[PDB]
């Protein structure tokens, strides 16, 4: 069966807080950055 | 105008469907399909709560029509009382599948 309990019922690991910081940073950061880059994409097409 | 060839539940039901069907025939409710009827809930006449383990969550509707349900774990051992109305409940553990 699957692991259960705190830190085990999630699709990401919280074993190391710094690797976690990196993960959360890429996750939330990629979401927040996308519109800026889409605008940039549209400005550079013409 | 008429004939047969269609199986019946008695001949073809299987798995859990068959279990519920055969148990219902003996008047039993191992899969909790029915709402149990309350006893007087006194110390001498507590509500008997079946369980296959040593604790079961009980939900007490203190008075008829109450919209608030009082929930608590009932453990094996001495009868416990509803935190709200004090009616008694006692766990009666194990079995189900022979």
């Amino acid at each position: 069966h699957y692991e259960e309990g705190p830190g085990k019922n999630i699709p990401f690991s919280v074993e190391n807080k710094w690797r976690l910081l990196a993960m959360m940073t890429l996750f939330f950061g990629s979401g927040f950055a996308a519109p800026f880059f889409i605008v940039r994409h549209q400005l550079l097409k013409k | 105008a008429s004939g047969g060839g269609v199986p019946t539940d008695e001949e073809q039901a299987t798995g859990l469907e068959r279990e519920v069907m055969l148990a219902a025939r003996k008047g039993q409710d191992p899969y909790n399909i029915l709402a149990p009827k309350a006893t007087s809930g006194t110390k001498e006449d507590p509500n008997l709560v079946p369980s296959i383990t040593n604790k079961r969550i009980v939900g007490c509707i203190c008075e008829e029509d109450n919209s608030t349900v009082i929930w608590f774990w009932l453990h094996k051992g001495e009868a416990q009382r509803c935190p709200s109305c004090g009616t008694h409940y006692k766990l009666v553990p194990h079995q189900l599948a022979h």
């Binding site: 097409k45 013409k46 | 199986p7 073809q12 299987t14």
Partner: protein
């Protein structure tokens, strides 16, 4: 025709730990792999198309 439901019930209730989508046998595995390959490949192809359509061809 004859009723072979009981045979199928035995096959699908066999204690082999297989999930229902694979419990029928080797064919289930093939069909699943075909399905998932077409889905994943088609998705990669769609991303490719998006990349292509994202830019002007004047």
């Amino acid at each position: 025709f004859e009723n072979r439901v009981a045979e199928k019930q035995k096959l699908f209730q066999e204690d082999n730990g297989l999930p229902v989508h694979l419990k029928g046998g080797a064919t289930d595995n093939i069909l699943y792999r075909v399905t998932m390959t077409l889905c994943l490949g088609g998705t990669l192809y769609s991303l490719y198309c998006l990349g292509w359509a994202s830019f002007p061809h004047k």
